[PDB]
Every structure is written in structure tokens, then in C-alpha cells.
């Protein structure tokens, strides 16, 4: 919805559709008829402590199928992607 491209270069540590972040790999973390639908953390292989409390975004797809109430009508992951996907495409998988 807005211009937020100046964070794809963030590697270490809101009404729009996608939260693009394909270059963030390590985290330590010490109406609503048109909302966010894609958590774009494609290259996320080390969450350290889980601490995952993201819930009830009402449209967030591909969060139940990611192995570490959000979206109940979602498209399937790529069958080559074997059901661990951050998105609908082959390059949107997970490794853990």
C-alpha cells in the first residue's frame, strides 16, 4: 500500500498486503476486509527462541503450514515445496 522497500537490507535485530523481508535470516528478539496476507520471511532458518505470538491477522496465509485463526481460506503451497511454504511460489519455502 505504501513504499517500505528500505528494509530488505535489514539482516539483524501496516494495513498493506505483503511484508517483504527475503533477506532476514536470524532473529533473537530480546472493516478489515483487506488486510495483510503474506508474511514474506522466505529465508528464515534460525529463529533461536520460538517466541511466536503472531495470531488472528484474519488474512495471514501460510502460517499454519510453517513448522517453527490467522487465515482460514488459503491457497496450497507448491507440491514440490512439500507443504512448508511462506507463500504460493516455489521460492517461498522453509528450511528447518
Amino acid at each position, epitope marked *: *500500500n*505504501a*513504499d517500505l522497500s528500505f528494509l530488505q537490507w535489514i539482516r539483524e535485530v501496516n494495513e*498493506f*498486503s*505483503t511484508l517483504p523481508l527475503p533477506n532476514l535470516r536470524v532473529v533473537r528478539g530480546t*472493516n478489515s*476486509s*483487506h488486510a495483510l*496476507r*503474506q508474511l514474506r520471511l522466505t529465508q528464515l532458518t534460525e529463529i533461536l527462541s520460538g517466541g511466536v505470538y503472531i495470531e488472528k491477522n484474519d*488474512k495471514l*496465509c501460510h502460517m499454519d503450514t510453517i513448522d517453527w485463526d490467522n*487465515g*482460514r*481460506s*488459503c*491457497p*496450497p503451497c507448491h507440491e514440490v515445496c512439500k507443504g512448508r511454504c511462506w*507463500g*504460493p*511460489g516455489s521460492e517461498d519455502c522453509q528450511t528447518l
Partner: antibody
Amino acid sequence: QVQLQESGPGLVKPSETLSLTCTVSGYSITSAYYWNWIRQPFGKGLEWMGYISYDGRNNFNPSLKNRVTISRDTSKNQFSLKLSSVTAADTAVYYCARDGDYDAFDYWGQGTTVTVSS
Amino acid sequence: DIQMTQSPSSLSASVGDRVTITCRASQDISNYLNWYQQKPGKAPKLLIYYTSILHSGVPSRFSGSGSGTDYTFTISSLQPEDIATYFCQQGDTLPPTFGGGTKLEIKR
């Protein structure tokens, strides 16, 4: 197996209210999905009235304000669309469709033809 | 407010030739763009959802491209089973508005 089908009267006077009912014969209605109404005037594009989620929400498409209403029954899988005070421009083919987040429409039902005149 | 254009509009093309139907959004954000194929007298059927990703059961012949606003429906080799009207879509707002409809006619 998901299938949608619509029923209702053919004509509607500009004084009465047109009522259409969409039923899902695939028994795929959960407290999950969005089911919406789409309009096609003859030789024109596709408009979109609005949807009803699992909870249910008010009218959409601000162009169709105070005219499009959607209801739910949960007994025999009925979603009733009412457009009140038709203004003779609603001579169109109507579709009831499913929804989601990425691929917006999946099955589309079949569509019924409605002509508005006296 | 909202607008949605499909460029080629009427489009002739022969059997077994690349076809590009260029869409547009007039919205800075339309990452989620779907391509439908509506046969004459039938309901629209889903071909592509979310730009590139093809929908289940759709032949891999159809493909999609484009990032910002300029989208592109490509057919690698047109066949006489493709003469339907090809529609666009967007999802970023309350109305999921479609395109004007690009009529594809095979030039036999």
C-alpha cells in the same frame, strides 16, 4: 468437491426488491470462507457487490450502497442477496462465488440472468 | 479511486503462436493479480493467481509476469480452445475490481 448454484425470480419491477439465493451443493461451507456476489451486464465488465464471511458483514462496493444486502441461514446453506429499488440498469448475469486471500475466486457457481423492467 | 485496464482488447492470433495480453493497475501496489478465462456464455474460470503462480488444473501453457502495474498474460502456443475472453483482477482494496476484458480471437 465444491459447487455453487443460484436461484430466484427472473424479472423484478423497479418498485420491488430482487432476491437471489446461492446454495453450496458441495457441502464445503465452513466457519472459514468468504462467499460473494458478482455482476456481469451484457457486453460489459464484471462488477462485485460484496461477500459474507463466516461471521457476516454489512454491504460492500460503495457504489451499491443501501441496495445490496446479504443474509445467512446455516441450515440449508443459503446466502440471500437482496438488491432493493432496482433502477433498470441491473439487467445482468449474476454469479455467486467463493473467495480466499490470494486466488480470489475459485468456483463461481453458474449465474442467473435478471432483467429489470415493468 | 480504482481503475483497471487490459491493453490488447480485441486480439487476433493464430494457433501455436505466443500471445501477450498486457494488463495494468493504476495502483502502485497490485502484487496479487489474477488472470481468469471466461468462455462465451460460461462462468469465469481461474487460470492464474498471484501474478506468476498457476492455479491447480490449469495448463502450464498459460503464464503471468509483471511486478508493479504492468502485468502480462503469456500463452506459449495458442490453441483453438483458448478463444475465451481473458479478464484480470486485483486484490489490494475492498472492491476486487476486474479488467475491461481482452477478447482473444484465433486468426485462422
